[PDB]
Chains A and B, each alone.
Chain A
Amino acid sequence: NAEFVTQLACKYWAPHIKKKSPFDIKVIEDIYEKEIVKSRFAIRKIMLLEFSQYLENYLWMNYSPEVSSKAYLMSICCMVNEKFRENVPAWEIFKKKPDHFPFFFKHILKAALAETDGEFSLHEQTVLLLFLDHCFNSLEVDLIRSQVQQLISLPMWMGLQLARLELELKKTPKLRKFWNLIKKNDEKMDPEAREQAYQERRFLSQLIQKFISVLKSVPLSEPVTMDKVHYCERFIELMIDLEALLPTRRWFNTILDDSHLLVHCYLSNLVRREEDGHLFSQLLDMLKFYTGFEINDQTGNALTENEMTTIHYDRITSLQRAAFAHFPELYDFALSNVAEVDTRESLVKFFGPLSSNTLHQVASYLCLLPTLPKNEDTTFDKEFLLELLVSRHERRISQIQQLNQMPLYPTEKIIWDENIVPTEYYSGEGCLALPKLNLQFLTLHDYLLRNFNLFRLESTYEIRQDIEDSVSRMKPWQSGGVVFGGWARMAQPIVAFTVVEVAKPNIGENWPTRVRADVTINLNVRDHIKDEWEGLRKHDVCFLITVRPTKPYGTKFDRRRPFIEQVGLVYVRGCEIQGMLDDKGRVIPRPNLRGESRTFRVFLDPNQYQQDMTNTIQNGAEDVYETFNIIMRRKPKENNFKAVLETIRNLMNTDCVVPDWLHDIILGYGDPSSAHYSKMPNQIATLDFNDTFLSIEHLKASFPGHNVKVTVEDPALQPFRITFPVEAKTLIVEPHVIPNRGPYPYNQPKRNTIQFTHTQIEAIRAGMQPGLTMVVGPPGTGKTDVAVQIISNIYHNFPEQRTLIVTHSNQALNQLFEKIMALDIDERHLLRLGHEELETEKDFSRYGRVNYVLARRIELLEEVKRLQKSLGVPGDASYTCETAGYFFLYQVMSRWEEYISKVKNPDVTEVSTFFPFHEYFANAIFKGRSYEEDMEIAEGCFRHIKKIFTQLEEFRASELLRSGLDRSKYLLVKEAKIIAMTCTHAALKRHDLVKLGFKYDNILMEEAAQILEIETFIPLLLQNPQDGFSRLKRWIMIGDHHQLPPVIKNMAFQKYSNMEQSLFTRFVRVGVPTVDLDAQGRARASLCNLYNWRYKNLGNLPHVQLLPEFSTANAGLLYDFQLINVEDFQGVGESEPNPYFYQNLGEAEYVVALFMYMCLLGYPADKISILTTYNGQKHLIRDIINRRCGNNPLIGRPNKVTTVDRFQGQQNDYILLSLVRTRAVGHLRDVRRLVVAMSRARLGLYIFARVSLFQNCFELTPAFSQLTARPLHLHIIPTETTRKNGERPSHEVQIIKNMPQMANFVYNMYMHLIQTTHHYHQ
């Protein structure tokens, strides 16, 4: 079939085909009928069709109303589903040709509303439900929104019962007139338009009815086809998505409530089928959580506790009034207050004994169902009415308590559940019961809950994997006891485990506030393992497992089989190591314990412990805390899931006071430009950009669209302050003189020298202005430079403010510190947090700052003693900070005040005659030219002295706090003005910051396109609100949304829930205005053009365009950029020595030969980096280098041999890239990774891969065509540099067409150089 589909593509729709035969609907019909329908919706066949550009070339462009059919619409829907499951743009073709899109959507709706099992099957109907879910999830595209508006508008309330609609109009009188207008609109339309509008308005209820009928079609225990289950899951998922979206929920909530689908899905036997309907049960639980969320659909604002209680009491009151006025048997229920009958128990006790007719009459009086005719019996089950009434009137728990009732650990029932913890093999055909975050959220609670649950489920995969690894290495066998036939590094057999503390829980909460337990393990391992176990500290996550093996001792273990039954997995629970005990019974100059036993105190989950105790007490379960036999430890760098989840629970338990201009922006709705600097009412008019602009010409040229008016005409008079209007495109530029800082010319403050462009100037200005500023920086766009300029401008314009620097890795922080070190930033106000190898010339950590503060305080005390001696004050006593301040305010302030009254209340000579610091400044003053100059010099000397006194007063805290930790806390809380850290360190220590009282006014973040959404929100709440308002003044995020996103360990959470979506990328997707740096400054323009098509006006800076080092060709290479097509080598193309460890022997060997040639020709091997698309390919290149070069003197080693995902932010002079994959394009289809792989080379890029497989890839065509604009065979110059890139070479042009020929040439050149040269490295 693959050859048939390939020939069909090449004949009718394939790209790279000059001429194809004309369009034929029989082609699409045959393809659908024989490949999609015949193969049972073959994922491989659908993927082949989607890669061949079937929809974009044949279906969509040739779709017409006279030619649209079931097969065509189904093929279009399947192609869209394949694009969505593959994470590629699926609506570009529809946007290019939106003509028949309304008819296409109308026909899709007509088909999806078809009676089940008719012309369309249940599989086609489930695929159509998935397509409709994607479309309703595609509310950002105008073409789909203009069609979905009619089916999700308030007119859709025409599908609700007339009594329910009347009750809604009575509850919302202001909507009634609106409905009337709608009715008037219905008068103006012809019969066909009115019929179509009514069909669209009732489509939602009709699909709900079809889903209810399908749900009833499932037998209880009889065999049922999975098609009904998949359709029910997809329909529930679409309903959940619609209910989680305010634009879709606003009117759909009332229709869903009138439909009572939740009661049916709670009453269907499908949810009772333990095996088939489990994932459907999770989806129904999520749908109930969404349908009962405390948010007002009309106002959109989250409902408080008072509003929820009032709604429940009003419902109870209406039910009591109805009962008392129409049912004597419930009169006492009508007489007793809400709470007495407001429990599910009370509601069942009072309402259960009544007949189905009585419950039906109540539901009619409660506006739930049609009125029961007199003498008629109800046709719904009594259980249906009973469950409906109970669920409507019973008490409901809050979402805050529901989250707080959740333990922080995943147990043995969760670690292996693929419905919520899907494996890495998740293809995406089935659904997963986890939320997704794409554009918007209901409230802050919805966003926080989604993020926390997703994080827990994502860490659960790695947890289950590591646990299985440890248990499988442990060899658990039977002997009724468990015997360990092997050893595990992170898992130790349980010697003892005993819960020693069950604290009384705080009232109201029914769980213990803290549970402790003492666990003894037997450190009978190698001393390396002994140290690895002894290195566990407080906050460590350890896992207690109790496994009851079933296989006899010596039975082989199989990793391919279920580990659960293989090792006898019984129970898995988490705990947090509080501390290791010593020989004195104290949880701990760490002591050296004796023996091979190690005792640790651990804290157990109070919620999980409460659940286990309740189960043991009520259901007779065995004691789960007395069966643990193994304890597993993990890597601390990968064991932060609990800390992040705890930060999430706390930030969901506080009021979440974020900036008033940022709440709606984060929520995904509203005006995306409401946080800009031009829209902020607190915008500053005149701002001091002194060290931003180097000259007046640069200042004027930084605003092409602005007219610069200077407050001084003198060209010798042009530090600059810029005042903006609010005709109006004029900027008032004022030059200024920085105050003298003393008689020392070396004390003059440094200035930044980076000649910022107009885009960088606008970005720095937006950073210096209040609001949210998004910077989109291409690779090498000067992001660090603009960031450092903004930080310096903020520190200099606002010295009373604090700046929080947030990075993703330590490299960005090291680069930011190195960039700041060149500016006028006092090192006493900068602080670096982290829990590492020093990369900076100075120490910015807490300890380095403490030592520097102490040394500067010593220097200040010595200078104060010298000043006292120069002033003639007797006394040999050494001064401290407090005595230094006293002596200052006594002698220096007094003498300065007297001299100021003398010369500032005026001859040029007396200004120096009255100077009281001549002997103090004798080591360095007055010129006697003019009065102003001498006055300024004396003021500068006094300013230096005042700086000495201020530094001493600031450092006195170091004598006030003896401990180093207290000194670091004092410096982080008050002394420092700029504190930098990582997103992970912040997410770990946010509670510590909030408790200690760290505050900040401006936030600057880099690499925001590499930070997770929760990792971007977590920095915004690093302190408490200020008198009811958030203290944050500016929020600047700089990154690249076209770059690599955050890493998701198990790619299923990214395929299904899009967890890799960064906050910056989401904010850009909403439409938030960002400033796009369009001038790169590190790599050649010919190489930068390979990725500049994906940026917004990404150009080249002057230095790269004129610099000579960027126009010199590569020695031994014809072109600076070459793509090498590598055919099959010895009958194999791509390889798989291990599962998923792809390699390509020919391409790897060719890269090795190219590196060998570059090394023998005289190129620096360290200036060459090796990148590969797979870890297996990188390892194959490494082994080949080890086996080919080894100890060869003429061939050195490359700087890096790794993947493109592991070379982010890094680069080399020359890059050899391997596209080894040849069967499928794979993860190279991601435009971000392609831009990264093409934007890592400084002067030369050589790629080895199958050109044809990637040229058929649509997403990479903008780079692939430019790469194929040159030959695919290696053009080298082995006879050679000073050659120009464009000047024709004066040497031999050798054409290597293959990898074997390249290796032969390399062997000949090496055999000639080893006889003609001799290296002596030893």
Chain B
Amino acid sequence: QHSRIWPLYLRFLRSHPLPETAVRGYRRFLKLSPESAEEYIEYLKSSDRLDEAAQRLATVVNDERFVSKAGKSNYQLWHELCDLISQNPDKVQSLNVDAIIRGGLTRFTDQLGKLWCSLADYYIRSGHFEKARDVYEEAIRTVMTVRDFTQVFDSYAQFEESMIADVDLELRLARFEQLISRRPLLLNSVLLRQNPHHVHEWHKRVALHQGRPREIINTYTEAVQTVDPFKATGKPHTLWVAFAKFYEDNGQLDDARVILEKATKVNFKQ
């Protein structure tokens, strides 16, 4: 009878959604049913912004057992998708970033999916005066060779320029200037630093020294750090001689004798 009154209640609530959540609670608190729970969750998500949609989203992302979420889907990502859709612009009480971005940061296991959703959640949740730089620092820490960071930089540039069309307008102008200074040269350099680094590729070493020229010379120190303990396969003298010719432009006095004194005790087979 309840299996006939609850569908009849959902069909009778087709003109006034007052008792629909109540019948859903009487069926979900008196019957374990994954398909009915998903139907009631879509029912409460058919509301304005978060009218009982947040409650069903929390009850669906809770996932104590493993039978209810596996009812009409099996991907282990629909709960994160629902948490991100709750992190969307809505009218819930707070539900700001905590559990959703927390879970999407610890057990993401999806390339550029949870990162972009977390950047957008910190972008527009409520004002985001400080959460914008939060998303920017999050993109600076985790990039994993993806273009979510540059998209977040474009979103950061967007709003101040849009507001102007003034200190925030200049902030957006500088942000776009940095995004243009984010040319794919650093991307190709990171590519040559990720994969061919352990491959003992001297070509990647020369590309890294080329991407670190003698004007950001701390980046020549980074190129020496790349020439540092991670060695190569029968070509370390060329890298060391490049570093020596670079330090010779650096006065030819400091860090010149010491490096050769270290190179006399680097007589290993590598």
Interface residues of A (CB under 8 A from B): 305-306, 309-310, 312-314, 316-317, 320-321, 324, 335-340, 342, 504, 506-509, 655
Contacts and interface: CB of A to CB of B under 8 A. Distances in A.
Query: Top 10 closest A-B pairs, CB basis?
Result: A339-B133, A507-B102, A313-B129, A508-B102, A507-B106, A335-B174, A337-B133, A309-B130, A313-B130, A306-B126
A306 B132 CA distance: 13
Interface string B124-151: 0011011111101100000000000000
Contact of B136 (A310, A335, A339): A339
Nearest to A310: B129
A340 B137 contact: yes
A339 B130 contact: yes
B136 A507 contact: no
A337 B171 contact: yes
Nearest to B140: A340
Given A305-B96, A335-B174, A508 B101 contact: yes
A335 B170 CA distance: 8
A309 to B, nearest CB: 5
Contacts of B156: 337
Nearest to B96: A305
B107 interface: yes
Contact of A314 (B107, B129, B171): B129
Contact of B127 (A306, A321, A340, A504): A306
B249 interface: no
B70 interface: no
Contact of A338 (B94, B126, B129): B129
Interface string B189-202: 00000000000000
Nearest to B175: A337
Contact of B130 (A335, A336, A338, A509): A338
Contact of B132 (A305, A314, A339, A507): A339
Contact of B171 (A335, A339, A507, A655): A335
Contacts of B129: 309-310, 312-314, 338
Contacts of B106: 504, 506-507
A312 B132 CA distance: 13
Nearest to B101: A508
Given A337-B171, A342-B130, A504-B106, 5 more contacts: A309-B131, A338-B129, A340-B133, A506-B103, A507-B103
Contacts of A320: 167
25 contacts: A305-B94, A305-B96, A312-B129, A312-B130, A313-B130, A314-B129, A320-B167, A324-B167, A335-B174, A337-B132, A337-B136, A338-B130, A339-B130, A339-B136, A340-B136, A342-B133, A504-B106, A507-B99, A507-B102, A507-B103, A507-B104, A507-B105, A508-B99, A508-B101, A508-B102
A306 B93 CA distance: 13
B98 interface: yes
A339 B134 contact: yes
Nearest to B125: A306
Nearest to A505: B106
A324 B167 CA distance: 10
**Most chain A C-beta atoms within 10 Å of own C-beta, residue among B94, B102, B107, B171:** B171
A342 B127 CA distance: 17
Contacts of B93: 655
Interface in B177-195: none
Given A305-B96, A309-B129, A507-B107, A339 B102 contact: no
Contacts of B126: 306
**Most chain A C-beta atoms within 10 Å of own C-beta, residue among B101, B105, B130, B134:** B130
Contacts of A338: 129-130, 132-133
B123 to A, nearest CB: 12
A335 B172 CA distance: 9
Nearest to B93: A655
A507 B101 contact: yes
Contacts of A655: 93
B101 A310 contact: no
A339 B107 CA distance: 25
Interface string B82-121: 0000000000011010110111111100000000000000
Nearest to B104: A507
A313 B128 CA distance: 9
A335 B174 CA distance: 6
Contacts of A316: 130
A633 to B, nearest CB: 32
Nearest to B134: A339
A321 B102 contact: no
A320 B104 CA distance: 32
A321 B166 CA distance: 11
Given A309-B127, A310-B127, A335-B171, A509 B102 contact: yes
Nearest to A340: B133
A1053 B126 CA distance: 43
B50 to A, nearest CB: 13
Contacts of B131: 309
Contacts of B137: 339-340
B101 to A, nearest CB: 7
